[PDB]
C-alpha cells in the first residue's frame, strides 16, 4: 500500500493503480498581512533624482 | 495585447514631461541676452550712454 500526499497523474497511473480520489487539490498563495507605513523619502518621491 | 505601454509606473514626473516648463526659462534668457546685446551694440550710436 501506498498512502501519502499523492496525486493521481497518468503517467504514475502506468506504474501504479489508483483508487478514487478523496481529496481535491488546488494551488494556493501564502501572503503577510500587508503594511501601510508611507515611505521615508516619499518626501522626494514625486521628482526623480 | 498591450492597450498602452505606460512606463510610468512610480507616478515621478521626469525631464521629458516637465522640460516644457524648462523652454519657459530658456526663452527668458534668449531674449535677455538679445536685449543686453542690442543695447551694448546701440551704445554705438546713441551718443550717450
Given at each position: 500500500?501506498g498512502?501519502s500526499?499523492?496525486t ?6 502506468n506504474?501504479?493503480?489508483f483508487?478514487?480520489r ?6 494556493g ?5 500587508a503594511?501601510?507605513?508611507?515611505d ?8 526623480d533624482? | ?8 509606473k512610480?507616478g515621478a514626473?521626469?525631464?521629458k514631461?516637465f522640460?516644457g516648463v ?6 527668458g534668457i534668449v531674449?535677455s541676452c538679445?536685449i543686453?546685446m542690442?543695447?551694448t551694440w546701440?551704445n554705438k550710436?546713441?551718443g550717450?550712454?
Amino acid at each position: 500500500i501506498g498512502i501519502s500526499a499523492l496525486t493521481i497523474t497518468p503517467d504514475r497511473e502506468n506504474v501504479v493503480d489508483f483508487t478514487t480520489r478523496y481529496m481535491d487539490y488546488s494551488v494556493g498563495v501564502l501572503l503577510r498581512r500587508a503594511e501601510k507605513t508611507v515611505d521615508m523619502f516619499a518626501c522626494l518621491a514625486p521628482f526623480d533624482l | 495585447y498591450s492597450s498602452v505601454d505606460t512606463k510610468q509606473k512610480g507616478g515621478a514626473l521626469d525631464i521629458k514631461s516637465f522640460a516644457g516648463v524648462f523652454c519657459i526659462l530658456a526663452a527668458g534668457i534668449v531674449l535677455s541676452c538679445f536685449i543686453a546685446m542690442l543695447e551694448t551694440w546701440w551704445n554705438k550710436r546713441k551718443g550717450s550712454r
